[PDB]
Subunit: 205 residues, 3 copies
């Protein structure tokens, strides 16, 4: 009989984990690890599809290198993809350096990586149809990068916290400019004649 190896091959492929959609149960942003719940059940011999185990202490990617990175404020319930490492990563995670596997389990989500993905749960404004956006998923607060311009939109404010902000060209401000507490639109100056009289009105062309 040859059905034997067919059965084996199937079992072995089912047991070998690679990638599946998954959800955050809990997340620690300082240690950048999560408890993760896979979101596709597996059919058992009994033909019952059942919920998979949680995975603990799973690193969540923070893309970055060279002293820079991108970090999202991950919440319980957020979704993404868990990947299974070839070997136990637990010692590597302790040291972030060259390590041995502490165990013999291979190709299992238990030692994996979670990559957050919002899937389709976002809105792109029509003006950004040809742009890259880094944004709230609502689309309300965004940095939009286009081929020759950048547009930064926020319903409340944009705050630039730095000692020196430099503009190498011109600047146009639609409404009010206040500098050190003084409204420039409406400002004046003391005259020499009449002595110490403030000029009339505000700033004019």
């Amino acid at each position: 009989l040859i059905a034997a190896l067919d059965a084996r091959s199937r079992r072995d492929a089912l047991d070998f984990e690679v990638m599946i959609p998954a959800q955050v149960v809990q997340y620690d942003r300082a240690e950048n690890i999560a408890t993760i719940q896979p979101l596709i059940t597996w059919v058992d011999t009994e033909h019952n599809a059942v919920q998979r185990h949680q995975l603990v202490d799973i690193p969540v990617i923070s893309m970055g290198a060279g002293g820079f990175h991108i970090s999202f404020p991950i919440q319980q319930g957020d979704i993404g993809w868990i990947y299974a490492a070839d070997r136990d990563t637990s010692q590597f995670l302790e040291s972030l350096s060259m390590s041995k596997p502490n165990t013999g389990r291979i190709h299992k989500f238990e030692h994996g990586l979670f990559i957050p993905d919002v899937f389709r749960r976002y809105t792109i404004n029509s003006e950004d149809s040809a742009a890259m956006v880094i944004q709230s998923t609502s689309g309300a607060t965004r940095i939009s990068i286009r081929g020759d311009n950048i547009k930064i939109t926020a319903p409340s404010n944009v705050t630039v916290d730095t000692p020196q902000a430099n503009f190498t060209g011109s600047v146009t401000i639609a409404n009010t400019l206040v500098v050190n507490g003084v409204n420039v639109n409406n400002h004046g100056h003391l005259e020499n004649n009449p002595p110490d009289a403030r000029t009339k009105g505000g700033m004019i062309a």
Copy 2:
């Protein structure tokens, strides 16, 4: 004979899909799914290397969590990597929640994830050699993050669309400042003496 299992092992490994470079045939940015064409052929028994099938309805990652994400304006022809999920993801994609596989196909690109990658098709300006950049691939329009400063460059304009933009330090503008339609470089004020005469010239030190 023992060559039997050697043949099996090889077949099974060839059939088990994980990751391959691939190209976007069509993309829907609202549903965040693509038709994808793998870019490496597979050699058949006949020793013919032939083009692989398109995959439809493949989610394209939008990295994000916590109400924020990053989205690129993916175009036909863009490249990247397709990953094969362990099990059918179609029901999960309908609901974005806990689900069963609708079918028995495992480790196939048919149910996968596409991650866009520009590979080497970009230019980094020399001034950004030690910086992170989020930019047009031409390098012309960029946000460059350095250890202690941020430089935002755009050939046309940078527009900040918000009711209130706050600078916590000083600001230097090279050229013209216009506020509510009035050129500040060149502005003046009405005098009390001579009555209602505009001051001479523009703004001076």
Copy 3:
């Protein structure tokens, strides 16, 4: 005996590479490829755990599409995850187009993709606990995106290099504003009477 296939299955799973943590040995940012050193040893038949081979010419992801991307200034020693492609990618990498495998090696890191990950080696400021940040890993220089506002922080400066910067609302500047070399806080104007006398002091309400 049936232990035979158990041994085979195990061997085949060990030989089949998918994903493991790894480190950059060398990186070329123009060609966007690296020499990579996996960071988990593998136990051999002799029960010796030993360091894995370097992989050369490994593409490092640059997430992007549609003419935009994100690039980090990767350094020797930076860490992340290497993924194994199903087939030889070398011809595909030459052309970035549809290709055959040059060889028969399958599911090996030798032809792979590296994704940089900083793991937990970063600091999130408490004010950003619910925000997305793109930042130096020190947390000192950052773009922080919140539900209705964006805060850009840099200890040295933020420079906006563009011919035209537009603010669609109001702007408040805490300290000094200089426009074309003239300090606005302290500016004045020539009077008509007294003829050509500069106004007293600086700008006042």
